[PDB]
Amino acid sequence: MRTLNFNGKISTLEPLTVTVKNAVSTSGHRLPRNGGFNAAPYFPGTSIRGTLRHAAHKVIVDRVGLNADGKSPFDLAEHFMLAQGVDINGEAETFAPGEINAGAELRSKNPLISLFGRWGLSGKVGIGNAIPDGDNQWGMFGGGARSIMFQRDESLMEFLETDQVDRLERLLEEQAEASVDISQIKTEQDALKKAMKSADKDTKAELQIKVRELDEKIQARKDQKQESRESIRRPIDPYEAFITGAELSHRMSIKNATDEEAGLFISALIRFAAEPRFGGHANHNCGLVEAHWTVTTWKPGELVPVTLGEIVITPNGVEITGDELFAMVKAFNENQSFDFTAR
């Protein structure tokens, strides 16, 4: 029953990106800014918390084990409650009498739910945001453009049959005519966007109805293009991300963590370190990180916090220092008295 503060840094082995829905102005994919347009982007604590929660879920299912066919004993509702925190059958209510003092026993039986909470059960774990140390350390990655294979390498013409060559050349011509006409359309559309940028109040809503109609029309023009509804040779939107090697100060804290809960969290970090991926763009190997946390506790009443140890996640391995963290992992593994079903 101690509060463990993992204070430390995330070094970015491959670019770190996240598509926060609010953050991404339709202008382009922007990393979630730490207040206003010009602040320092941060990696959300939400994405890290979700990654670590799925890692803990995998730890729990692997520790419970699987049947001979390889099926977890749990059911769909139990999985969704464990990792997503969402109750399928609706058996989750907040401030409901009678579940009071069922929190202690439930947490003892379900260290995962104790850590990450559920709807109405406060999660002991708080996974802070990743804040870069230095200036810069963020920029636009990805970009590029999907291309037609056959203008890139002519050899693939020799695999395709003549009828398929005809199909590919009708595909080129129809994509290119759709391109030019969608283009002139967008050109008048942005001249109208300038008109809107110099239109009045409550007169622009009719021009906006017009714009939504243009949009519908565009999507219909798209529809009635047979198979290749989508432009093939299309540029790929850049995604903002933290540069490789970016140092991101991170503060995570487990509030009033039993040795079992801390052990489960640490094991969740051991399992996460197998694939240290955060965020998205895993196609571009984005998300890979090596992270070192100094775990410090602070007994309430004491003036300074003691350092229980260090957790260094690295591609070469996971290094755990201090006997406190080993004892916590061993305590969690040894405890057979967990229940992850019912309630």
Partner 1 sequence: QIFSGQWLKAVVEQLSCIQGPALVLTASHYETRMIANQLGEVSQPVYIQKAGQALSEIIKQYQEKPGILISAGASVGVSPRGENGEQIFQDLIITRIPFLPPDR
**Single residue of 68, 100, 304, 342 touching a copy of itself by CB under 8 A:** 304
Sign of CA dihedral 271, 273, 279, 282: negative
Q: Rounded to the nearest whole angstrom, what is the least distance from the CB of residue 217 to partner 1 in the complex? A: 23
**Does residue number 194 form part of the binding site for partner 1 (CB under 8 A)?**
no
23 binds, among partner 1, a copy of itself, none (CB under 5 to 8 A by kind): a copy of itself
Enumerate helices (H) and strands (E) in the chain, giving the number of each: 9, 9
Rounded to 10°, the helix 259-272/323-334 angle is 100
Per the CB < 8 A criterion, the answer to whether 265 and 308 are in contact is: no
**Does residue number 197 form part of the binding site for partner 1 (CB under 8 A)?**
no
**Does residue number 284 form part of the binding site for a copy of itself (CB under 8 A)?**
yes
Binding mask 176-215 for a copy of itself (x = CB under 8 A): ----------------------------------------
Sign of CA dihedral 103, 109, 112, 113: negative
What would you report as the CA-atom Rg of the chain, rounded to the nearest whole angstrom? 26
110 binds, among a copy of itself, partner 1, none (CB under 5 to 8 A by kind): none
Q: How many whole angstroms separate alpha carbon 91 and alpha carbon 318? A: 38
Region near a copy of itself per CB under 8 A, out of 48-56, 93-101, 174-182, 213-221:
48-56
- β-pair type (2-12, 306-314): unpaired
Q: Rounded to the nearest whole angstrom, what is the least distance from the CB of residue 308 to partner 1 in the complex? A: 57
DSSP string, 53-85: HHHHHHHHHHHH---TT---SS-HHHHIIIII-
**Does residue number 331 form part of the binding site for a copy of itself (CB under 8 A)?**
no
107 binds, among partner 1, a copy of itself, none (CB under 5 to 8 A by kind): a copy of itself
Region near partner 1 per CB under 8 A, out of 3-11, 32-40, 200-208, 238-246:
200-208
Region near a copy of itself per CB under 8 A, out of 177-185, 191-199, 210-218, 269-277:
269-277
CA 337 vs. chain centroid, Å, equals: 32
**Does residue number 208 form part of the binding site for partner 1 (CB under 8 A)?**
no
How many residues belong to the site for a copy of itself (CB under 8 A)?
137
Per the CB < 8 A criterion, the answer to whether 44 and 329 are in contact is: no
Q: How many whole angstroms separate alpha carbon 123 and alpha carbon 52? A: 13
Q: How many whole angstroms separate alpha carbon 238 and alpha carbon 166? A: 33
Q: Which two tokens stand for residue 269?
A: 């970090």
Q: Rounded to the nearest whole angstrom, what is the least distance from the CB of residue 193 to partner 1 in the complex? A: 17
First to last CA, the chain: 23
201 binds, among partner 1, a copy of itself, none (CB under 5 to 8 A by kind): partner 1
Region near a copy of itself per CB under 8 A, out of 30-38, 93-101, 182-190, 200-208:
30-38
**Does residue number 171 form part of the binding site for a copy of itself (CB under 8 A)?**
yes
Binding mask 229-268 for a copy of itself (x = CB under 8 A): xx-x--xx-x---xxxxx----xxx-xx----------x-
**Does residue number 203 form part of the binding site for partner 1 (CB under 8 A)?**
yes
Query: If 0-12 CB within 10 Å is exposed, 13-18 middle and 19+ buried, where does residue 240 land?
Result: buried
**Does residue number 299 form part of the binding site for a copy of itself (CB under 8 A)?**
yes
Longest Cα separation, the chain: 82
**Does residue number 327 form part of the binding site for a copy of itself (CB under 8 A)?**
no
Sign of CA dihedral 100, 104, 110, 114: positive
**Does residue number 341 form part of the binding site for a copy of itself (CB under 8 A)?**
no
Binding site for partner 1 (CB under 8 A): 200-203
